[PDB]
Design a protein around this ligand. Structure first.
Ligand SMILES: Cc1ncc(COP(=O)(O)O)c(/C=N/C(CO)(CO)CO)c1O
Ligand SMILES: Cc1ncc(COP(=O)(O)O)c(/C=N/C(CO)(CO)CO)c1O
Ligand SMILES: Cc1ncc(COP(=O)(O)O)c(C=O)c1O
Ligand SMILES: Cc1ncc(COP(=O)(O)O)c(C=O)c1O
Ligand SMILES: [Cl-]
Ligand SMILES: [Cl-]
Ligand SMILES: [Cl-]
Ligand SMILES: [Cl-]
Lengths: 445, 441, 445, 441
C-alpha cells in the first residue's frame, strides 16, 4: 500500500451526517427512481457527485465572509480580489463573474463570431468545437494532440479558427494534466496562424502540481512560478473558481494584456449579463472567500496532501485488482463499470449499476460517466453507446478524511466481490429529450 | 409633520464608516471623473445607488448562512426555500435562480418566440402600457393594453408582465383591481400573465394602505390574492426578500408542462435545478428573508421611512416625484437646476453635489443615464430629469434619513450659484452612464 | 430641542423584536411578579437594564470571532489582545480575564491584605471600603473629594490604607466623569503616603471624551492621548471590558510597571482562578472581539455620536419638564421617580412604580436605583430608605437609534401625564435575605 | 490490528497550520525555555495539551452562535440551555456557569463548611478513595470510603464526589454499579452525593461497551440512570459537550432549598443567574453541544479514535497507561527513559522529543508537574512518570493519529541515545510546571 499525506490543517467546524442502514439506503435509491441526482444530500454519507463548489473553506475565508462589502459599485471586497488575481497570474486585468459558465458567456463571444470554430484538448463536450485530444496511445495524458490541431488550423482556414482553448487539467480524460511543454507547443501554433489562446483554468492548481511533480526540470521550481509561467503562453483565461480556489461560488476571467481591447468589451458584456463589473453577479461575501481562497488553493503543502489523497486511493485500488483510469487525475477516480459488470451491456447502463450499488453499500454518491450520461441520439433518438463506462468519484477539497477514503475503496471492493450476482442492469422509465441523465427515472430488470 | 416609525428591531452588528472631509470628498470625486460609479464604496457615507442586494439581514438569516447545505443535488437549503415559496405564494412550483435577470432568461424563452410582451413599465420586443402619470400610479393602462393586443393581434402577444412595485415609475404601486382587470384580459385572449415581483411586499403594503376595503386584510392574504391572478412570476430576490443574492421563478399550476422547460433551461443556463446558481448560504438566507420581508410590522416601518423623507422634502418645498414610491425618492433635478439644460445633465450635478455635501451616493435617472441616439450619437433629451435615492432595507436610521433631507435642502439653497453642468470627456458606445468620464465647464 | 449625532456607521445585521400590545405587556409584568428581572428578553422592546456586555460589535469584530484561536497555551488570539492593551494604555503588562469582577479578584488581594482599607470615589457599594465621593455641593461631578481622602489617609494610618481606586466614569453618581485634574490630585496623595493607585476603567473611553469636551485645555487634544495620560497617574487598572470596548464578554488587568512584582503574582493568581494566563477564562472568539473592540471604543467619531445620544435624550427631557441627574452621564439617564410620584413613599418603591410603568407604556425595561434596590438592613431587617429614587436607563452601545430614544423620552412623558392616577406603590410578596431586588416578587396595593 | 472508525461527519471549515522544519522547531522550543507551555500555538501541529475547550463545533452550533441572545436577564439562549439540561439529565434545576471551577465555587460552599469531601480521584479538605489500579478503574473504593466516613465520623464528611470519567486515573470509566453502591452509602449516612460530570458521555459509552447488560441500553437511558443516583452534579462543559466555554450545575430535586443558595451564590460570584458569566453565543453553542456530545454514532467514533491509537502503541510495544481512557493516552515516560531519573523529568524529555519529532505538543504528568515540597523545596519524586496526549473532539483525523503513533515509536527507538534529562533554571514558588524555565545537562 501507500501512505496517506496528513492534512496540513486541523478541523475547526464539522457538518454532522445522519448514518443510514443499508435497508434504509435501499429505500432511498428506490424512492429516487435509481437516479442518484434525486437523492437528498441529507441521505448521502460521502457525496462525491462533484468537486465543484462543495469544498470546505478556512477560518480565514469565513473571516472575510463576515467582512464582505456588499456595495453595488466599488466594494472594497472587489479590489482585494483583483489584487490577488493580478498577483498570482501577473495578468493585467481580472474580472469577477458568478459561475465558471458565466465567464465564457462574457468573454468567448467577443472573439468567437458565430460561424468560427475553436479547437480544444477535450474528449466530450456540450458545445461548433473541434476536439483534438492527444490519443492516450502513461504520463501527462490529456495533452492537446499538437499535430492534429496544427493540421486542423489548415483544413479549416487559419483566419477562421476563432480560438484555441486548453483546459487544465483536462476534465474529460479524468483530471489528467498538461505539460509545460504541451502548453508552449500549443501556444506556438497560436501565434503563427494568429489564433487567440484561452486557458480554461478550473483546476489550474492541481495542474501546476502535476507539472512540478512530473514534468522534467520543474522538480525544484516554485509552484507560484509554475502557475505564472503557464499564464504566459496564453492570451487569456476563463475559470470556474468553485474548483481549485477552494470556494463555494464564483468564476474569473483574466486577460494578460493590460491594454487589450477585450477589456472595455468584457466590462460592457459583464454589465449586461451579470451586473456592474465590480461585483459581477458575485456577493461581497463570495468575493472575500475567493480572494483569500485563491492562495489557499496554491499552497504547496495543500497541493501535496491533495495529490496524496488521490495516490492513496489509487494505490489501494491497484492492490484490490479494480480497474480505473490508470494515471489517476487531480481530483478523483473513474471506476471502469463495464469491467466489473461484463453481464450488463452498455444500454443497461453499467455505470448506474455501480453507482446505485455503491450507494447501497456505504451511502457513497457517484454518477455514471458512461452510456447513461451520454444520452440518446439528438436525431435518431436511439440510445448512444459510450466509449467507456465509468462511474466518477469527484472529491471536494479539504472535506473528507483518510477514513472516508477507506470507506470509498472498501465499498468498491465489496461490490466487486458480489458483482456476479446483479444479472441485469437498469431500464429507463421516463426521460426528457434533453440533459437526460440529470432527470430520468430508472428501474431494475 | 410626519414622525418616523421606530425600527421593529435592534442593531446587532455594525459596519463602521470612515467620515470624510468635505475637502477630502471633492478630491475623491474629481479623482473618480465626476461619475458616482467610480467612487470606492469606502468613501461613501449614505450609499443609495440601489436597494438591490445591499440590504442588512437578520441574525436569524445569518444563522441560516452558517447552516447552509452546499450539496450539488438535494441540499437541505433548497427544500426550505421551496417550502417558503410554495407557502407565501400558494404556487405549485418555485425554482431558485441566482438573479432576477436569470429568472427572465430562464422563464421567458419558452413563450417569447422572436412576438411581443406588454409591460406596465414606463421606460426601457417590449410594448409599454402603464397609465399616464393620485394613488396606484404603477397601474397598467388596461384599455390601452387591449387596444395593443388587437392592434398586434393576440397571436403576436407572447406574454404580459406586470411589475409590482412599478420601478420605472418610481416605485408607484399597482392596484389589486388593476391586476384582476389585467388577468381577465389575458384569460380572454389566451395570453400568459407573469408578475415581475421584485418589490411585491412594498406593493402589498401599498394596497393595504390605500385600496378600498383592504385596510383590514393581512399582508399574507393580500400577497396570496395578487399572485392568484397570475400564471407565474419572476423576481430578483435582492429587494423585498432582504437578501444580497437571489432570484426566484414561480409557476402557479403544479402540473403545468412549463415546469420541465424551466428545469431544463435552468440545468443548462445556471446549473442543477436544486441550487440554480445559488450557494448553500444564499438559499438559506433567502428562505428566511422571504418571511421577514413581508412582516406587517416591518412593512409599516419601511413605508414610514419613505413617508418621513417625503414629509421633510415637502416642509422645504423640494420637488420630488410624488407620491413617494415604496423604496426611495426621485428628486426633480430639472426643477432644482433650470439654469442647467438637459445635455449638461441636471441629474448628474445634483448627484455630485449630494456627494460633495454629505457623502451621499445617488445616481442620475435623466439625460446622462439615457445616453446618445443609437444611430446619431447626439445626446438624447430625457423626458424627465431626476436623482434617485435608492434605500437599502434595515441599513439606515432616522438620523441618516435626516442627513439626506438636510443635504437636499442645502444643495437646493445654493443651486442658483451653479450655472453650467458637466460634459462627457470619454465615453463607451453603449452603457456610458456607468463608466463614462465627466468634467465641468 | 437638540440635534442628534448621526451614526458614524451603517447597520449590517439586525435582531428582530416581537411587538407587544399594552394589554400583552401588562400580562408579562404581572406574570413576572412586577420584577423587571423576571421578564424575558423576547418580551422587551428597548432593553435598557444594563450597558454591560449588551453592545453591538462591528463586522470587523465578528470577522475576528471566526478567526479566534482556541489554543489553551499561547493562542495567537491572545497576543493581538495584549499588543492593543500595551498600545492604547502604554502599560508594560496586560492580562486577559473573563469578567470585570474577575479582574479585581485576581489583582486587589495581592496588595489588599485582609484588614487594610481602601478609599474610592463612589457613593454606593457592595464591598471594608472608605467612600470619599466629592459632594455634588454642575460639571465634572463624580470626582474624588481629594480633601476628604487626604484626611482619611491620616485618621486611618498611611501604611494601613491598602490602596485608592478611582473608578471612571463614576457609576454610582450616574456616569459622571473625572477631571484630568482630579486624577493628578488623587495621584499626588498616593505617592506621598505611599499608597497604590488603581483605576477601575469600565467606562474609561466615555470618560476621556468628557475630559476632551469639558476639562479646560483638552479641547484640541487627541483622545488617544487623553487616555494614555490618565493611565500615567495610576500604578494599575482593572476593567470590565463589557462596557467601553463595545464587546459582549471580557475583563482586563494592567500594571504600568513592566518589572512590577505584581506581574508574577497576577500570573499565578490568574492560573488559579481563571486558567492559564494566555486566555484567562476567555475564549479565542472573545479575545479577538476584545482586541479589535478596544479601538472601536476609542474612535473619536464614535465618542461624539455616543455623547450626543445622551445630550439628545437630556435636552428632550429638559424640554418636557422631567427630573433627572442634571449633568447627564456617559451611558444614560436616571429619572427621579420620587419627583414624578410624590404619593408613593420610599417603602412603596417609586422606582419600581416608574420602571413597571414605563414597561407597560412601550416595552422599555429599566430598573430601580432606589429604595427597592437598596434592600433591608443586614442586622435590623427593616426596609432601608434611599437618598434618591432613580430608575436607570442604561444604554448598550451602537444598538438603539434616534427613533428608539424618542420611544424612551416619549414613554417617560406619558407616565408623567397620568402619574397622579397611581395612588399606591408596590409591596414585597417574597424576598430572599440577600441580593433582594434581583429576585423578589411584588404586587400592587 | 484495530481499524479507525470513520467520522460521522464531513469537514466544513478548516484551520490551516504552517508546517515547520524539524530544524525550525528546535529553535522554537529552545527559544521557549524547553517548556511546552511557552510555545506559541501557531508553532504547534497536533496540539494535545488539553481536551478542555479546544473542541471543534458543528455548523449547527455556529448558527447557534449567530442567534445568541445577549440579554442581561431572560435571554432566549438561557431557556434553550435550561431545557437541554433538564431533558438530558432529568433534573429539576440546571444552572449555567462559565467554568467547571465556577460550578464548584458556586455549589460546594453551601455544605463544605471549613469538613471533608471524599473523591474517587487519585491525586490533587479532599480525601481520595479510588480503587487500587481490568475494566472500570475509575471506580471509587466503596469499602474504603465507608471506612473513612466512620473514621472521620459522618458529621465531618460534607459531600461525596464521583468524577466520571475519572481523569486522575487517565480517563478510566466508573461502573454504573459503583455509582449505585456509592449512592447507597451516601443515603445511609445522610451525605450529599455530587457527580463531577465533565466526561459523563465518554463514561456513558464505556458503561455501554463493558458493563454487563448495558450493551443494549441507549446512551440517553444510561446517562439518565447514572444521574438518578446522585443529588446534584457540577461540570466543566468544555469537554464532552463539545464547546469551548461553559460550566453547568444541576440539582435533581426541583423543590430543593439548595437552589436559592445556588442562585444567590451565582448572582454574586458570576452575574445574574440567567447568563451566569456566559454570553449569548456560548449558551447557544452549549445547548446544541449537549446533545451532539451524547450521540451514539459520535461516541462510537470517539472511542474508536482511542482504541485505534492504543492498538498502534501495542503493535510497537509502547508502554502506555492501560486500558486507554476515554479522552487521550498517557505514555509511560519512565518506561521509555530509565536512564532518566525522576528529578531530571522523563516526562518532560518525551514531551520535548515529541514536539521535536513531529510538532506534537504534550505535557508532563510526572515529577516536573508536581514540583517541590511545600516546606522543603526539594524535588518530589512523582509516583508515576507519564506524558499526556489530550485529544480535543472532532479536530484530528486518522492521519493525525498516525502522526502521533509514528512519533512515539520513533522517539522510542532513539530514546537510548539520551542519557540525561533537564534541570529547572528559573522557577516560581507555586505552579512552576506551567511557567518554569528548563534546560538540558
Ligand atoms: C424589477 C427588477 N427586476 C430585476 C432587476 C435586476 O436585478 P438582478 O438581476 O437580480 O441583479 C431589477 C434591477 N433594477 C435595478 C434597480 O432598479 C436597475 O435599475 C438593479 O440595478 C429590477 O428592478
Ligand atoms: C473534571 C474537571 N473539572 C473541571 C476542570 C477545570 O476545567 P475549567 O474550570 O472549565 O477550566 C477540569 C480540568 N482539568 C484539566 C485537564 O483535565 C487540568 O488537568 C483542565 O486544564 C476537569 O478535568
Ligand atoms: C462538474 C461540473 N460542474 C459544473 C461545471 C461548470 O462550472 P461552474 O459551475 O463554475 O459554472 C463544470 C465545468 O467546469 C463541471 O465539471
Ligand atoms: C451593571 C453592571 N453589571 C456588572 C458589573 C460588573 O462587571 P462584569 O460584568 O464585567 O463583572 C458592573 C460594574 O462594573 C455593573 O455596573
Ligand atoms: Cl451585492
Ligand atoms: Cl454549491
Ligand atoms: Cl479556550
Ligand atoms: Cl451578555
Amino acid at each position: 500500500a501507500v501512505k496517506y499525506i496528513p492534512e496540513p490543517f486541523r478541523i475547526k467546524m464539522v457538518e454532522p451526517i445522519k448514518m443510514l442502514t443499508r435497508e434504509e439506503r435501499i429505500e432511498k435509491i428506490k424512492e429516487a427512481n435509481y437516479n442518484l441526482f434525486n437523492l437528498k444530500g441529507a441521505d448521502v454519507y460521502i457525496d462525491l457527485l462533484t468537486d465543484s463548489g462543495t469544498n470546505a473553506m478556512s477560518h480565514d475565508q469565513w473571516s472575510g465572509v463576515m467582512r464582505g462589502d456588499e456595495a453595488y459599485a466599488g466594494a472594497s471586497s472587489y479590489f482585494r480580489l483583483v489584487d490577488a488575481g493580478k498577483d498570482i497570474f501577473n495578468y493585467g486585468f481580472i474580472q469577477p463573474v458568478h459561475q465558471g459558465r458565466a465567464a465564457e458567456k462574457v468573454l468567448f463571444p467577443t472573439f468567437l463570431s458565430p460561424g468560427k470554430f475553436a479547437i480544444s484538448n477535450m474528449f466530450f463536450d456540450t458545445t461548433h468545437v473541434i476536439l483534438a485530444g492527444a490519443r492516450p496511445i502513461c504520463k501527462f495524458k490529456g495533452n492537446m494532440d499538437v499535430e492534429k490541431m496544427e493540421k486542423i488550423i489548415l483544413e479549416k482556414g487559419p483566419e477562421n479558427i476563432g480560438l484555441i482553448v486548453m483546459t487544465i487539467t483536462n476534465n474529460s480524460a479524468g483530471g489528467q494534466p498538461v505539460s509545460m511543454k504541451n502548453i508552449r507547443e500549443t501556444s506556438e501554433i497560436c501565434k503563427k496562424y494568429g489564433i487567440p489562446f484561452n486557458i480554461d483554468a478550473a483546476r489550474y492548481a492541481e495542474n501546476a502540481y502535476f507539472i512540478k511533480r512530473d514534468e522534467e526540470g520543474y522538480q525544484n521550481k516554485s509552484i507560484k512560478d509554475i502557475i505564472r509561467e503557464t499564464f504566459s503562453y496564453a492570451d487569456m483565461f476563463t475559470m470556474s473558481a468553485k474548483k481549485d480556489t477552494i470556494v463555494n461560488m464564483g468564476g474569473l476571467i483574466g486577460v494578460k494584456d493590460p491594454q487589450s481591447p477585450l477589456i472595455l468589451k468584457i466590462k460592457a458584456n459583464c454589465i449586461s449579463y451579470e451586473g456592474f463589473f465590480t461585483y459581477g453577479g458575485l456577493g461581497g461575501r463570495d468575493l472575500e472567500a475567493l480572494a483569500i481562497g485563491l492562495y489557499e488553493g496554491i499552497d504547496e503543502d495543500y497541493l501535496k496532501y491533495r495529490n496524496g489523497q488521490m495516490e492513496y486511493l489509487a494505490s489501494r485500488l491497484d492492490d484490490a485488482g479494480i480497474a480505473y483510469q490508470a494515471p489517476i487525475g487531480g481530483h478523483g477516480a473513474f471506476i471502469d463499470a463495464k469491467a466489473m459488470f461484463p453481464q450488463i451491456p452498455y444500454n443497461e447502463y453499467p455505470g448506474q449499476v455501480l453507482a446505485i450499488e455503491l450507494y447501497i453499500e456505504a451511502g457513497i454518491r457517484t454518477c455514471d460517466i458512461g452510456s447513461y450520461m451520454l444520452g440518446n441520439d439528438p436525431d435518431t433518438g436511439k440510445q448512444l453507446e459510450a466509449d467507456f463506462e465509468f462511474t466518477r468519484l469527484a472529491i471536494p477539497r479539504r472535506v473528507y478524511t483518510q477514513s472516508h477514503f477507506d470507506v470509498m475503496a472498501d465499498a468498491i471492493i465489496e461490490v466487486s466481490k458480489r458483482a456476479h450476482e446483479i444479472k441485469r442492469g437498469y431500464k429507463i422509465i421516463w426521460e426528457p429529450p434533453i440533459l437526460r441523465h440529470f432527470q430520468a427515472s430508472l428501474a431494475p430488470i
